[PDB]
Amino acid sequence: DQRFGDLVFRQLAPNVWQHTSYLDMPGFGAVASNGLIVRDGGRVLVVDTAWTDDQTAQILNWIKQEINLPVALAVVTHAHQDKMGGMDALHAAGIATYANALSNQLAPQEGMVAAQHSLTFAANGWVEPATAPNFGPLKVFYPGPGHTSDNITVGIDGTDIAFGGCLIKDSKAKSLGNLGDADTEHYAASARAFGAAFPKASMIVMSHSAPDSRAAITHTARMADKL
């Protein structure tokens, strides 16, 4: 709804905004990637960078203008350019960054800058609380390998919102996207584990489509069933 530089920002809930940045892909044009911004009391929480450091500095600029609270931390949901391409801008701003330990391990070979802190997960997928200090309403869940081996998801406590990142596609999508890094054998179970971990969430936020209903989860799982 709201333009700011080349970025776009839309409010989803009282204290929740989706940030959107675009990268030109050869032979297609502008590809959208979405993350989240969350106001928790007198601090801001960011889920995912933009594609670039410049775009990510613009997210911080927008936060300063529209919210005017410091950014306490950022969580990034896997080690790909659309989620972690802007890590340097976060670190330059003095923001504490968090990622799945596996994302941090993969980040060098994926061409990304690793986050400063590492999240680890229990066998049921939930983040170990000790690795995720003062995450406010952010509930962080590792659903298993799918889009990548490291992809994680975030629900926002007190809202109807759960963020699937690039794991989940919208209910009208045609493909699961590029399968180069994908765990085709476990994708279906991982999508359904995300759905089961946030069983009441009704607004499913994702990386490359506008928010959808839980049919996005069912349809994504249904596509993966065929792989």
Ligand X SMILES: *C(=O)ONC(=O)OCc1ccccc1
Should residue 208 be labelled a site residue for ligand N9J when binding is judged by CB under 6 A? yes
Q: Residues in contact with ligand X, total (CB under 6 A)? A: 11
- Nearer to a copy of itself by Cβ, of 69 and 179: the residue is 179
Among 4, 8, 81, 131, binds a copy of itself (CB under 8 A): 81
Which residues have a Cβ under 8 Å from the Cβ of 167 and sit 6 or more positions away?
143, 146, 147, 151, 153, 190, 191, 194, 206, 220
Instruction: Give the amino acid at 152.
Output: I
Of the candidates 60, 20, 4, the residue with the CA atom closest to the CA atom of residue 211 = 20
Answer whether 100's CB lies under 8 Å from 142's CB: yes
Q: Is 48 annotated as a binding residue?
A: no
Applying the rule CB under 6 A, the residues between 158 and 187 that interact with ligand X are 169, 173-174, 177-178
CA-to-CA separations, 122 to 23, 129, 142, 178, 190, in angstroms, rounded? 35, 10, 9, 28, 15
For the record, the structure tokens of 221 come out as 């799982």
Q: In the beta sheet, which residues pair with residue 139? A: 155
Among 1, 14, 27, 199, binds ligand N9J (CB under 6 A): 27
Q: Is 66 annotated as a binding residue?
A: no
Q: Pick out the residues of the known binding site.
A: 53, 78, 80, 82, 88, 110, 147, 166, 181, 185, 208
Which residues form the interface with ligand X (CB under 6 A)? 25, 27-28, 31, 169, 173-174, 177-178, 208-209
Which residues form the interface with a copy of itself (CB under 8 A)? 24-32, 80-81, 170, 172-182, 208-210
Q: Pick out the residues of the known binding site for Ca(2+).
A: 53, 88
